[PDB]
Amino acid sequence: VHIPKAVYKAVYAHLYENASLALKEYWRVGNVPGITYVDENGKLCNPTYLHVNCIMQSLESRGVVKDTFAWRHHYYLLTEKGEQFIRKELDLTDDVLPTPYSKPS
Amino acid sequence: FLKETFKRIHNMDGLVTGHRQVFKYLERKRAKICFLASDCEEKQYADIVECLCKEYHLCKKFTRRTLGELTGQVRCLADSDKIIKVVPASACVIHNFVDVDSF
Amino acid sequence: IVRRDEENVYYSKYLNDCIMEAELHEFFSRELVDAGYASCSLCRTIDSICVIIQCAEPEVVMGDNHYRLHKIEYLLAGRFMCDPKNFNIWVDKIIKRGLSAEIMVDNLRAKLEEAMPIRRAAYSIIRTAMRAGAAGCEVIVAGKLRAQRARANKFKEGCLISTGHPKRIFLAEATRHIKMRQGVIGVKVRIYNPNIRGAVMPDKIEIGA
Amino acid sequence: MHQKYTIIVVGKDLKLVERYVKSIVKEGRAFGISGPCRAPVRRLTITTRKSPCGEGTNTWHRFELRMYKRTFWVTCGGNDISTILSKTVVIPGIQVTVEVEEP
Amino acid sequence: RNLGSCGAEDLDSRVHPSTIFWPTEADNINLASGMRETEFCTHIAHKRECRICGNYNSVYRKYGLFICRRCFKENAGKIGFVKLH
Amino acid sequence: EPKKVRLACLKYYTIKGDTAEPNCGARHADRCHCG
DSSP states (O other): OOOOHHHHHHHHHHHHHHSEEEEEOOOSSOBOSSOOBOSSSSSOBOOBHHHHHHHHHHHHHHTSBOOOOOSSEEEEEBOHHHHHHHHHHSOOOTTOOOGGGSOOO | OOHHHHHHHHHTTOEEESHHHHHHHHHTSOOSOBOOOSOOSOHIIIIIHHHHHHOOOBOOOSOTTHHHHTTSOEEOOTTSSOOOEEOOOOOEEESSOOOTTTO | OOOTTTTHHHHHHHHHHHHHHHHHHHHHHHHTTTTTEEEEEEEOOSSOEEEEEEESOHHHHHOTTSHHHHHHHHHHHHHHTOOTTSEEEEEEEOSOGGGOHHHHHHHHHHHHHTTOOHHHHHHHHHHHHHHHOOSOEEEEEEEOOSSSSOEEEEEEOSOOOOSSGGGGTSEEEEEEEEEOSSOEEEEEEEEEOTTOSSOOOSSOOOOOO | OOOOEEEEEEESSHHHHHHHHHHHHHHSSSSSOOOOOBOOOEEEEEEEESOSSOOSSOOEEEEEEEEEEEEEEEEETTOOHHHHHHHHHHSOOOSSOEEEEEO | OTTOOOOTHHHHTSOOSOOOSOOOOOSSGGGOOOOGGGSSSOOOOOOOOOTTTOOSSSEEOGGGOOEESHHHHTTHHHHTOEEOO | OOOOOOOSOOOOSSSSSOOOOOOOOOOSOOOSSOO
């Protein structure tokens, strides 16, 4: 409900660098093992399912991503509108592209 | 010619507004510059802080209203532009500092 | 002379990966509807994963400059927790789409969602199959097709098998669900190719001169 | 040199497992030997009610998953670190047939 | 209520510093990493559920599956289970 | 429904640059945040 900005930035960066996010359907207390952020917290701190789930709800509502639920897993993908939005929250300059376009093969 | 820099700062929330927050930020000694209001009803909110800053790098913009939107603190449409809704701040403090051309 | 607590790792390292494949089947089916998705396969090469796809028109899923594919690869890896760039993918193209039940039934679903009547859609599907060289196709459309009191009317053309082990080789079946304003419209397809691949249907004898 | 290496291959269907066997035996005759051991079949059994609701005659499904396993540990010292690779890439790349190598 | 203490007699009798046995079930490492927060979900307990439909009843744990019997007949052919004999 | 009260001048613990409040931060004292 009260989400730190480090978390927002972390989620956005994870999206851009991976263009995706596959997330569990969970509502109890727990910590996501993937996306991590540092706020003087040990070496790194992991977030909580609640914050990230609220974030993702909002994003998909705005049209940034498109879900594709499955065996009780959330599969999100960022679109073009989303790219044209993530590119400015992170302060990215124009022309920059995410890694999957970087000829993985 | 100073607005150009603040835009990135607020994205990391460096700019800080409010009497109960500006006070504490400077008293910890972690501030670069501070600003004021063109005026205000009571000196206290103005003349109390000014000494606390001189005694412990100030400016003053005759438009106290610019200090509101320059520090975010504005409502805009989902489609860019803006609501023309501005809360009139009165003091701001730069922590991270993350302008140099003007000084 | 041997311990049974150790090989359980080999046996349990096969089961997990068979399951991992099914989730992908579901996900692709819910995703690559427009690319003529049919099936999937996997190869657990230690260094990296390889997945082989069967799609009518891969260039759609390929994406300009291979963007959709790459967007997919990074995604799966996070879920199955593999280092991306070791989660590569390959796509293969089906040439006899009329022999594939999935393509047919998905096309039928599309055509139905455009309001066209069932009588035309089914028989267009069936003509398409026969042109492909098939010995039979049966279509079924059950649900609230009229005002109320749902009924099933089935269309067919040729000859079909219905029992025996041979039905697991020469008979290809599939189903879907179609959500509409009245309700849900169940649809299913089945096609019979006796001369498929190289296997020979039993009780089939050819003589000489 | 000599590393006592062992080859284990696992599959659920009996037709490729025997085909993979032949290719390997063909390609390992020189780099030492490669005679197989056929293990007892691990058969997984699951019995389920054929009904989702529990009505009518109590009728049961009987699934199973046979898993076949073969083990060529005959390389032994007859294969070096790179020599194992040679054949393993010269054998066919059947889509599904798990393989693991250990000394 | 940090300024709340108890007699020493009522302290050694307290449960030894041991991790409550109930560990829950994490089908995958992804699905976790260890005001109302004081009692949101303190009743830790096994919550094993189908990895397809999420139901807590009739779950085959045998072989490390974790699939409901109903949610099973459908996907069994894909997995490789077949009906013979 | 806590019975809070409203004050606009949350800034007069001190007179002029003073140290009234027991960096920064009857029954004795009860410090903000933890004890």
